[PDB]
Design a binder for this molecule. Structure first.
Ligand code: NO2
Ligand code: NO2
Ligand code: NO2
Ligand code: NO2
Ligand code: NO2
Ligand code: NO2
Ligand code: NO2
Ligand code: NO2
Ligand code: NO2
Ligand code: NO2
Ligand code: NO2
Ligand code: NO2
Ligand code: NO2
Ligand code: NO2
Ligand code: NO2
Ligand code: NO2
Ligand code: NO2
Ligand code: NO2
Ligand code: CU
Ligand code: CU
Ligand code: CU
Ligand code: CU
Ligand code: CU
Ligand code: CU
Lengths: 332, 332, 332
């Protein structure tokens, strides 16, 4: 009887940050309420000024990470304002039935809907838009995110002992397929609907023009680098709604990885690189042991360093010479 | 001494159905006899009327699923009638030696051969044609299928308790590479041999023109949708003989998945999407909990909704509002 | 205190062979010293005489396999002679900090450097060149290899019992992207630097022109086939520094596979085919049971038989008819 359960309202934050939550559940099951507003907007995705018409949940690519516990109810109010032009919906891979909620959430511009589902399976899961006849176009225009359903007693290692993270980041990786003219220049369109048939042709090549983290080439660099300190335990959630990726922390490892993101399974240990299949979210836990700049990449290095799938951590603290040292610096 | 073992003759059925078998072995080891006849035939693969010269085992793409138990002997009579034009053979990934039987089964049109092998390893496995110098052409023309070798005591969960399926379906996913003229129109050929050099060039792009389930775009839809009922336990065997795929049940999960298809390993639990590498068969077990239409896709959504890798389940029974419900239907 | 540890100098051997080592450690932790010399050289990669400017560690593609034990120190002297033209470095995925050593090992032609790191995590790991702004170009020109960090007590099966290999081979798989003129003919260049902008354009297609084992189409065939005997236990280490692969032994299996190469995890059993993600090394253990020719392939069969990713084992000994036999040889 759901009317007797506590309700809690959560305000979502922009990726790669994550809203505040408890790892170990401090209450019984709740109905957790979220609101998202669909925004169709122009996005500049690279250093050259290439623009697309992005389709977003809450104004960002990816959409924000939602965090609940196993056997909570998720109640989502989804708003499609009349400033948009397209019909949208939402499919949660975490949910059971009705095409993951897609069949129940079709909203024209000017409409809203509220869906509730029970989070019965622990893990990270993709959510994405999926309107009949236009599914890949929506998804590859940026309309995807993830939801983390924590076990009520938090995360566990391969022996069942507690694993506790100090920080958590969300990396959404996005494949874009920007249409090109005959010579290979990217095309521009006034509206999203203009691009439709050129978008289909670009997608059918199966060759993305850009692969980015957090919506743009270089989005997780500079002043937007991820930060941590030596000794901190960091959880990195990584989603790809459409195409396989293979994350790698340059200078580190995945100490504990759930590559396909489902926490009832034991993690894989000591990974150099792991495969997250398209349509999946995964999670990697790492304890930093050395200070400095780290790069976090898709380890198809072309996709990383030419197409955009690379970000940075900046880590503070003490250098450990036992782990690594230059015995003879580069010299003639 | 094989002459003292019982012999049983099995008649194969068309995919996505599977011949009758026992999950838990009701007899000791047997020699299980199968016959397959190679058919080269014209196939229409999409709604536009694109035709290829398919190369098939038993007239279907994929070839039929064979089912035996661990330590049975498989005896296959392979017939290549003189109405075909090409040399064929068979390679079982389940078998040990002689290129999986490929070296022993080369049959010109007008010839037959009988191979026997012992099924020493439990799991689902690919089989495919593999004639010297023309291996990918045969495979990507549809000449592949799968064989399931059940443990003698049936399937087990991650704790070693019995898992029993009520229904079993076989989904063969096929990458096709249809040659195109300069403008991008699909070419046509009177005979398979005509296509050879254009087929090689099309394959070398590594970009399939169509990716389909059960031999055609929309083959597992409409009146050919897969069916189940709420509460039924369904095993879905999925093979891809040449290229990676990432199955996903839209509105459901893989409760227990053997992504690389080998049953001595514990299954992965609660999967949203799983990766079956090319040259592998995998298996996913799901208990349906909600009625309605489900879509089963390769979750590269371009491959699914543009190139053809999507089918449907239609599930009957009672809706459960506790799992999912529309709190406020789409409204202005 | 590292000055009190024994030092041992190892001389590396050309792939696919591996330098002599102990499986179970016969000493305490050591500093293990290796030298590698960078060689930029012309390489013929296919039967047609296509040439590239390869960038190599120690003259080979892949670079040589290094073998140490968990908690040894690796000390590498890296030499870039003044006959080379480019700046190089090395990144070990086995190492912790400084971009896997990349930040500390930048060597112009005419320079050398010595790096030491502690091998804290057991497994096979990729190493590769990774100079700032030119990472994929170096890697896809062949500048990668692998390092195996054995547990001090050797390898273990899924139950923790010892697994001992009689032979070990290293297969480096390399994706090349040879630039093409308008008609599709491969281009030629006097120097590596000439190719730079054409190399970037070729890479951005994400479509390799050649995928090879040990640096050339057909390198592991003929008199260079891998050898074994019936009853031998063989470990095959396989790396791919940039792109996913799916190894398969034709006529055999992976009895025990660490697909992502990290030995603290239990192996997967009875694999037909396994996925090694790009930027990973994996390892497969097999006991041969039948004599004859086996092919070891990437089971995207186009990549194998058209693009070059295939090699051979030749296995000697006794044929076992119980496992497989021709009951009726091919006949009219
Ligand atoms: O600015 N809206 O695509
Ligand atoms: O956009 N309707 O609230
Ligand atoms: O789905 N593409 O890896
Ligand atoms: O091909 N998937 O990155
Ligand atoms: O190890 N960095 O690609
Ligand atoms: O999907 N389990 O990591
Ligand atoms: O109709 N045979 O290709
Ligand atoms: O086609 N020979 O039976
Ligand atoms: O083998 N192609 O995923
Ligand atoms: O790229 N494999 O679907
Ligand atoms: O969740 N359906 O792509
Ligand atoms: O291959 N084991 O699922
Ligand atoms: O011959 N050096 O590229
Ligand atoms: O190339 N310097 O030793
Ligand atoms: O990274 N390509 O499989
Ligand atoms: O697409 N990787 O072989
Ligand atoms: O089974 N050989 O591709
Ligand atoms: O990465 N473990 O096989
Ligand atoms: Cu949408
Ligand atoms: Cu989906
Ligand atoms: Cu054939
Ligand atoms: Cu095969
Ligand atoms: Cu280099
Ligand atoms: Cu790397």
């Amino acid at each position: 009887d759901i009317s007797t359960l506590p309700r809690v309202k959560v305000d979502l934050v922009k990726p790669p940050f994550v809203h505040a939550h408890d790892q170990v559940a401090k209450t019984g099951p709740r109905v957790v309420e979220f609101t998202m507003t669909i925004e169709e907007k122009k996005l500049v995705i690279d250093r050259e000024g290439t623009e697309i018409h992005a389709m977003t949940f809450n104004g960002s690519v990816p959409g924000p990470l939602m965090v609940v516990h196993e056997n909570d109810y998720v109640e989502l109010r989804l708003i499609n304002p009349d400033t948009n032009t397209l019909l949208h919906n939402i499919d949660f891979h975490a949910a059971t039935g009705a095409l993951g909620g897609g069949a129940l959430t079709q909203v024209n511009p000017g409409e809203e809907t509220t869906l509730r589902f029970k989070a019965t399976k622990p893990g990270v899961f993709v959510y994405h838009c999926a309107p009949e006849g236009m599914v890949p176009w929506h998804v590859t225009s940026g309309m995807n995110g993830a939801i983390m359903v924590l076990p009520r007693d938090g995360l566990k290692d391969e022996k069942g002992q507690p694993l506790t993270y100090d920080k958590i980041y969300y990396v959404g990786e996005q494949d874009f397929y920007v249409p090109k003219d005959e010579a290979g220049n990217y095309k521009k369109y006034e509206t999203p609907g203009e691009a439709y048939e050129d978008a289909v042709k670009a997608m059918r090549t199966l060759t993305p023009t850009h692969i980015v983290f957090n919506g743009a080439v270089g989005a997780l660099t500079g002043d937007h680098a991820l930060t941590a300190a030596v000794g901190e335990r960091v959880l990195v959630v990584h989603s790809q709604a459409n195409r396989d990726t293979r994350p790698h922390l340059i200078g580190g490892h995945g100490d504990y990885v759930w590559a396909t993101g489902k926490f009832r399974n034991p993690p894989d240990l000591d990974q150099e690189t792991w495969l997250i299949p398209g349509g999946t979210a995964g999670a990697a836990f790492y304890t930093f042991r050395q200070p400095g700049v780290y790069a976090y990449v898709n380890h198809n290095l072309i996709e990383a360093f030419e197409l955009g799938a690379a970000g940075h951590f900046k880590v503070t603290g003490e250098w450990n010479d036992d782990l690594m040292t230059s015995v003879v610096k580069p010299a003639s």
